[PDB]
Amino acid sequence: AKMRAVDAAMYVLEKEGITTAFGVPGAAINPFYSAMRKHGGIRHILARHVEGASHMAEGYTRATAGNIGVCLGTSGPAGTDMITALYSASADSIPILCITGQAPRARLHKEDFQAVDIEAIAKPVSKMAVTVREAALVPRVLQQAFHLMRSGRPGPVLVDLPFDVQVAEIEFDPDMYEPLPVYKPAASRMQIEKAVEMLIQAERPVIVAGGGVINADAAALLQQFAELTSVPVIPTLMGWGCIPDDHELMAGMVGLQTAHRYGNATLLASDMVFGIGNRFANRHTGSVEKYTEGRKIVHIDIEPTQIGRVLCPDLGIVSDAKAALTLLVEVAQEMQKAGRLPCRKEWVADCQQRKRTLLRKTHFDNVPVKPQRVYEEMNKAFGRDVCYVTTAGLSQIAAAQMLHVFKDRHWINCGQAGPLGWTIPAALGVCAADPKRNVVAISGDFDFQFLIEELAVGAQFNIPYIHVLVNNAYLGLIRQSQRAFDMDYCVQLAFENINSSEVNGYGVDHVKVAEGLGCKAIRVFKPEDIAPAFEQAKALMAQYRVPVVVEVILERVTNISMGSELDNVMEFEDIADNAADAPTETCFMHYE
Amino acid sequence: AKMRAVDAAMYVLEKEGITTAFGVPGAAINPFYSAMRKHGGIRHILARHVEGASHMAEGYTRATAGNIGVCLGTSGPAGTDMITALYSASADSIPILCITGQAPRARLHKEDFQAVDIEAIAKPVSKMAVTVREAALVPRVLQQAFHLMRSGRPGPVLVDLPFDVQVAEIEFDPDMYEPLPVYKPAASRMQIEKAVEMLIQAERPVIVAGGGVINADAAALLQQFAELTSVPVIPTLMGWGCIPDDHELMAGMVGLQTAHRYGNATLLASDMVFGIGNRFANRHTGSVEKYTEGRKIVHIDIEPTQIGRVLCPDLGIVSDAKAALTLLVEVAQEMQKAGRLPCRKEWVADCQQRKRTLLRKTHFDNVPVKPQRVYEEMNKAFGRDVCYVTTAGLSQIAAAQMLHVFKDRHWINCGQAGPLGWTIPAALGVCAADPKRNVVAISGDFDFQFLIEELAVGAQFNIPYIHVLVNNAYLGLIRQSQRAFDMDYCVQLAFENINSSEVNGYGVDHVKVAEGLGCKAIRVFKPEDIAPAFEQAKALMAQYRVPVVVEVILERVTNISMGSELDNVMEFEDIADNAADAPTETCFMHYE
Amino acid sequence: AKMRAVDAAMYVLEKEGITTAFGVPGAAINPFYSAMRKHGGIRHILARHVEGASHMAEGYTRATAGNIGVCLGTSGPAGTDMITALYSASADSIPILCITGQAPRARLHKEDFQAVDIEAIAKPVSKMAVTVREAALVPRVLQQAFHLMRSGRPGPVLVDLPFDVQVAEIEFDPDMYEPLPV
């Protein structure tokens, strides 16, 4: 019967499916740590920055449907160090549960050491942020937290626990605890029949499959619906993987940066966008006037106030993507049996022809190394089960342009917020979620430096993955954005390293740093040494069971393809219309 | 006449005295960077984490009276990464100016890439947080920002700049720009005369000199007033340095952790606390009932709502500490000339006797090294002009117990928030403020890891200082706090480093990491090698002009003295009553 | 197909079962009153204090299970005059729907006559308080409002409508509108 509030909390977490937490203890959260030790059901991973714990939790969530990453911390600056992750999780409609210690209730207005109003700070980037005011409410707040994290548009929750609230005794019967029901609206048959009637009337439709499809665990249904209707599929960056890149209907990605020449050309040639669990992000659309010109728009979203937010759909449907796709498949089957689905061989052929011809060169023998070549080598070295984790920079943009993925939740990327430092901890979090996953991270040098210390978490806990580090001794994306201002200013990271003449003025020696943090590292200067470096990295991983960093020394300056509209993406580097120049496109290469 | 809003902003910053900024550019803040380049008056230092830039700005502010550290960043996660510094600056009543880029005004409700409501997030930890809605307001918001940062209780400001607002042209005449007046209330003669009458009637008074004395640039007046009245001075942690540690009236520090046995004993023996620019923090007082028992309390504070917040003073006076101390000196001089100031030889003698006898041992020859010995060696190796920078941990607590400082702004410490990672960037910020300052940082291993990458900022920009790193492969303070829970759980950082058997299972190899980041580093295992390591560090600094890390390998477990009340501080390690055991107390050693 | 956002709002209110509103018009909410007149399905009762309209809405809700009283007002002080009712409705776990007119979007930070941040004021005493920033979202915000007023612990909602948002044309098919599940 009688236990501390925090002891009750462990029973709640266990019943809600939690088996892992990432965190940094402190005096104010010690009662919770005490409870976690006595209960024994949760594996704790000690981060080397509270921000690191917060992004580990994000990776854990993103790795596997139903996962909820947990981030623990003390009072005061621990909560403030979780805001960037709450923002990133909110921004991408995924949940993490942050739990912070706090000063005792009676001391909250008294400027106690490390007492901050985390409720007010976190409110704008959470579905709920609450300082729990009574011991008996601790289980109830967690119970509601799980309901909110799973329901509607998913998002994160912060629970703030005054010390005295944590340690007070309550009566709690674990056998009587039950998770709450999850709220998800479902499209009616009438909605879905109208959508399919509209699709049947389009001559050149595409499905734009967003992150909501993955959130809903509906990848197989999305592919089934596309196959039944013979409609090309353009994943958003957040939908990437919900149909394999080598599927005959996968028509590429669209947008201003993380996009294909063939994807943009297909979108602009289409007469309908059938949007499922997407939200028409500005870096996907450019100007919405241009994106929607001559096109009917269908938009299916779980969140009513996402529909009409940035563009007006011809038909907007409020629905969970799995519920919607179940009915879309069933209606499509009825239409097929009635002979009412049109044959789309010519439009599909046209999309595949663009995908065959409108390429970018990757096969460069240049020294110093061209980044494009790294992505080619990654495609060749890893299997189709590879799981990529990345953030933002020319590193990530060119990666999204040139790598291939074949499974949902095998592109793990903070698409809306892009906080530098996210990559290392997020990757560790994916690995903790799934120790059999083949995780390969991609970072530029600056991203890799923000939370570089988190490599030692991988060393201490023996969490193996391969980290690809593409080093230009620059904030490369920011250099490129500064061309509009005719400058290159405060974006260089180069210096003569007094301990390493072998980095040739590139500044930080990432091999020495990674090795100091307990990991393994290989530096590559020549494009023909990339493939053997990847093979060696796999061997070192197997042998030592720690992260292995493969650092490629790039040319300082490479302008990656991008523009302000779909029809305006500038190609600075060589394009390609043949496989020899772009040999790892799925049309030319069998993956696995 | 006609220039961009951001060009006007550079003229405002110049006229407001800004010469330095710390930051990380991004597309949304590039117009401001463009303006900064064209204008040329501000030295920019590129951080390797936005959080790093934010704490550099804090160090810069703290180094020298009138300084205002500037932190620049892009939209979205850059602002969220500045919250911990806004909190820390607010918490300690010091200003930083954060400036963030933002999405264009028309796009603010549209989930543009990296658009976040930073105004709402930062409001709780700033004097003003504002998204500027018109180009013409940019100079006016900055003008008001400087007024608020300097006025009343100081604190930080965040200015958020939509891209379109930055680039729009306004008409601005730099010659017509004038900073606003600064609001500071001043005590009346009637207030100060009552305070001095009350002081004259005390038999055993102490002055508690807080951070407000330093904030007001009033250290010399504080010492003058103490000398005229012959009243012992107890600095708060945030007041430390406002009278030299070797002054005959400096009676030690008080509290639960960063405090002296003699300080606590003096406070408990006193019959009056004369508080000037302090606020009676809970780690200074313990229970206020015990702190105020048998004592009259005077409290002078610039902020009305600080007076009576945690304890009821017998006399509370709203005043700037410099204004107050000017009048306190003048009234004390009148009282002296009238023969009305009592002679306090016996009480002063009693305070000095406690300071002579109630010590803690530092002189340990143990291997592995006892942390206490490190502080002894630091006192001997550095001059009286040393400037210490630190955060929190057993590292910082024992430092505050055992190091000595002789000048105001030579203890630079985030006393109220204690965010791990603060030390490295804050130190770099102090160095940037004053290139002739002799900066010595103190970190535990965990603190040192949070923002370890910032060492490469020191390497790239050639910013020299000495960083003392006391390594126990533990969150030592948290281990010690967990004794109350009979556990040692999730607080160890040790592992067998696969690249360094010479760290003997301590985990991270800080010498390899520091050297990889472009700095110099020396590891010490034996107490007699500390002094020569400090001499070598000075030589390497002079030669290479980069940070030099001196890592001392400590015993894993040392319980530092601390308790829950002034009369309850537990001494786990050996105390001392003689100089041989504690040879660097000012009574026994001449500093410089 | 094409009608003003406020015309779409009338169809949403009809489909959500509204037949009655209590209110006080003003210039900023006149487009909504215009739409209510054209549509014809709602009996308006004109109060002699906005506070009076707001407590009429409360009484209407409380009278009969499923009822949701609607309170209409202009910008500025009309919304501030509804705060007491929002508080009372919240406090007793019952819904009212308050609709306020508002200055045009481009004028929201410009101290326009009677422009107030009613979103911030009403947030503490409502399940949702929102200034609608696009015409196409007007029907979706109302759709979400009815879900929130009926679901979980019931409580009130305030919807604040910039003038330009009210009058802008959108595509809206009344036949395809369905209330959300509770």
Ligand SMILES: Cc1cc2nc3c(=O)[nH]c(=O)nc-3n(C[C@H](O)[C@H](O)[C@H](O)COP(=O)(O)OP(=O)(O)OC[C@H]3O[C@@H](n4cnc5c(N)ncnc54)[C@H](O)[C@@H]3O)c2cc1C
């Ligand atoms: C440097 C950089 C460049 C980029 N360039 C591009 C680019 O060129 N092209 C591009 O497309 N992206 C790009 N992105 C990513 C971009 O910012 C967005 O993150 C992305 O386009 C949004 O994907 P989405 O529309 O699928 O939205 P998501 O953020 O995945 O959300 C879509 C919708 O899912 C809904 N939802 C949630 N759960 C469910 C459910 N169960 N059922 C149904 N709906 C649900 C939500 O309500 C939401 O409205 C880039 C990112 C970076 C960092």
Ligand SMILES: Cc1cc2nc3c(=O)[nH]c(=O)nc-3n(C[C@H](O)[C@H](O)[C@H](O)COP(=O)(O)OP(=O)(O)OC[C@H]3O[C@@H](n4cnc5c(N)ncnc54)[C@H](O)[C@@H]3O)c2cc1C
């Ligand atoms: C692990 C750890 C242990 C600690 N242990 C102790 C301890 O044992 N003892 C201890 O004392 N501290 C300790 N501290 C520090 C403690 O938390 C507080 O930061 C500190 O005691 C507050 O100092 P203060 O009262 O001078 O306040 P400050 O934060 O310096 O502010 C005092 C007042 O100055 C006022 N003010 C600002 N400008 C002016 C001006 N111009 N004129 C007049 N007033 C002005 C403000 O309004 C404020 O009320 C510890 C910190 C840490 C991290």
Ligand SMILES: COP(=O)(O)[C@](C)(O)c1sc(CCOP(=O)(O)OP(=O)(O)O)c(C)[n+]1Cc1cnc(C)nc1N
């Ligand atoms: C009194 O306990 P606390 O308030 O819990 C405190 C002082 O605040 C500290 S100190 C500390 C550990 C410091 O470890 P170090 O190796 O740096 O120091 P040490 O081993 O103690 O000499 C931690 C994790 N925290 C907690 C902490 C956690 N996360 C952040 C961001 N900042 C913190 N500062």
Ligand SMILES: COP(=O)(O)[C@](C)(O)c1sc(CCOP(=O)(O)OP(=O)(O)O)c(C)[n+]1Cc1cnc(C)nc1N
């Ligand atoms: C389109 O520009 P942006 O939005 O400004 C963007 C994508 O967001 C980026 S990417 C970037 C530089 C990345 O440098 P890397 O060396 O990691 O990569 P690269 O050199 O481009 O291959 C910076 C500083 N920021 C800005 C940035 C700054 N601070 C934080 C915390 N996160 C950021 N992500």
Ligand SMILES: *C1=C(C)C(=O)C(OC)=C(OC)C1=O
């Ligand atoms: C290349 C492309 C681009 C195709 O679309 C295709 O059909 C799916 C191929 O054959 C399978 C191909 O090799």
Ligand SMILES: *C1=C(C)C(=O)C(OC)=C(OC)C1=O
């Ligand atoms: C030791 C102590 C503690 C004193 O107080 C003192 O007087 C100021 C000394 O002599 C100067 C001393 O050496």
Ligand SMILES: COP(=O)(O)C(C)=O
């Ligand atoms: C940090 O800015 P920099 O001085 O590095 C430049 C002038 O490019």
Ligand SMILES: COP(=O)(O)C(C)=O
């Ligand atoms: C992170 O927690 P640990 O597993 O390290 C422990 C059991 O002490």
Ligand SMILES: [Mg+2]
């Ligand atoms: Mg894959």
Ligand SMILES: [Mg+2]
């Ligand atoms: Mg780079």
Ligand SMILES: [Mg+2]
């Ligand atoms: Mg000194």
Ligand SMILES: [Mg+2]
């Ligand atoms: Mg870091």
Ligand SMILES: [Mg+2]
């Ligand atoms: Mg330690």
Ligand SMILES: [Mg+2]
């Ligand atoms: Mg106006």
Ligand code: NA
């Ligand atoms: Na492959």
Ligand code: NA
């Ligand atoms: Na000295």
